[PDB]
Amino acid sequence: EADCGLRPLFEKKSLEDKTERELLESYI
Amino acid sequence: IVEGSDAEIGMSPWQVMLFRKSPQELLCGASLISDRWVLTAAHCLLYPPWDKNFTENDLLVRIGKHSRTRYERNIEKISMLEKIYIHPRYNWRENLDRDIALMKLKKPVAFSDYIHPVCLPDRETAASLLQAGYKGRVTGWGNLKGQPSVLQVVNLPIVERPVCKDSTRIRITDNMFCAGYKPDEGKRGDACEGDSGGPFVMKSPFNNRWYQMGIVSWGEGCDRDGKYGFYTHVFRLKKWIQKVIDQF
Numbered sequence: 001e002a003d004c005g006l007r008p009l010f011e012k013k014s015l016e017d018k019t020e021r022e023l024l025e026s027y028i
Numbered sequence: 029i030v031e032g033s034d035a036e037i038g039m040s041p042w043q044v045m046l047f048r049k050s051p052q053e054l055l056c057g058a059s060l061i062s063d064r065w066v067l068t069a070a071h072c073l074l075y076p077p078w079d080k081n082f083t084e085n086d087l088l089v090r091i092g093k094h095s096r097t098r099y100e101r102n103i104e105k106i107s108m109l110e111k112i113y114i115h116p117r118y119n120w121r122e123n124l125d126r127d128i129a130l131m132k133l134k135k136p137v138a139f140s141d142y143i144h145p146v147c148l149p150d151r152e153t154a155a156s157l158l159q160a161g162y163k164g165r166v167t168g169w170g171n172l173k174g175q176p177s178v179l180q181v182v183n184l185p186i187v188e189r190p191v192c193k194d195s196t197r198i199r200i201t202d203n204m205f206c207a208g209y210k211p212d213e214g215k216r217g218d219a220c221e222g223d224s225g226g227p228f229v230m231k232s233p234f235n236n237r238w239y240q241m242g243i244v245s246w247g248e249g250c251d252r253d254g255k256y257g258f259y260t261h262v263f264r265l266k267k268w269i270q271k272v273i274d275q276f
Contacts, residue, residue, distance in 0.1 A: 001062060001145070003144075003145075004061075004145045004146060004147035004148075004237065005145075005146055005147035005232075005237030005238035005239060006144075006236065006237055006238075007038060007039070007041055007144060007238070008038060008041065008140070008141040008142075008144055009036075009037065009038030009039075009041075009141050010038065010039065011236055011237075017036055017039050018033070018036060019033070019165075019181065019183055020231055022163060022183050023162075023163045023164070023165060023183055023230065023231050024231060024233050026161060026162050026163040026185065027157065027162050027233060028161070
């Protein structure tokens with residue numbers, strides 16, 4: 001729970017996945 | 029999933045696959061919300077017009093999977109179910125309102141690089157993110173069939189409520205939302221049957237966390253044609269989720 005939603009291979013490593021920018025750009 | 033792209037390893041570590049034991053078959057998606065609790069759609073477990081009424085011993089889940097057909101040694105984990113809880117107001121007769129269920133694992137799963145829970149939304153995250161045009165993400169296996177088939181990903185915009193309402197015969201409720209691109213074509217990705225029960229997730233730019241905003245509800249094959257997929261509104265049902273977990 002404390003650590004929910006933070007992916008070991010992405011957020012925790014300061015790495016982004018290939019399409020997450022598409023989500024964040026839509027949040028206008 | 030149709031018209032998706034290959035997910036990366038570790039990209040959806042909360043993804044859970046729900047299987048019938050005998051004969052072995054993939055039934056639905058689902059999501060890991062803690063080391064012992066899994067969220068899915070009620071219709072994955074209970075749908076009487078199709079003689080579907082599973083008990084705990086009928087089912088198993090696999091967690092941490094990337095490839096549909098390759099066994100992933102030391103990575104993927106299998107768990108049996110201790111208990112199934114279906115929403116008591118799940119409306120299977122008419123519109124599948126409150127299409128939600130919880131499954132308790134017989135033993136906790138160990139978290140790893142490939143296995144990790146998704147957050148449930150709080151009020152401010154739901155207020156901020158659940159807006160028409162904002163995109164969420166669904167993951168599942170290529171419901172197009174094939175050979176290699178790794179997990180696929182599609183990112184789909186939330187649809188305006190009146191547009192949703194006009195696209196379907198069903199009486200839509202406030203406990204549902206719909207997502208997907210228009211017929212005249214923004215793109216053409218979508219969640220399919222088989223992806224049902226899986227999570228619709230959104231990433232908060234405020235705190236960098238992934239939240240499960242929706243559960244993929246009813247779909248048949250991948251033909252919605254002119255239609256949009258419907259999703260169970262997780263935030264609106266969050267007190268029910270908490271009630272079940274706190275009691276059991």
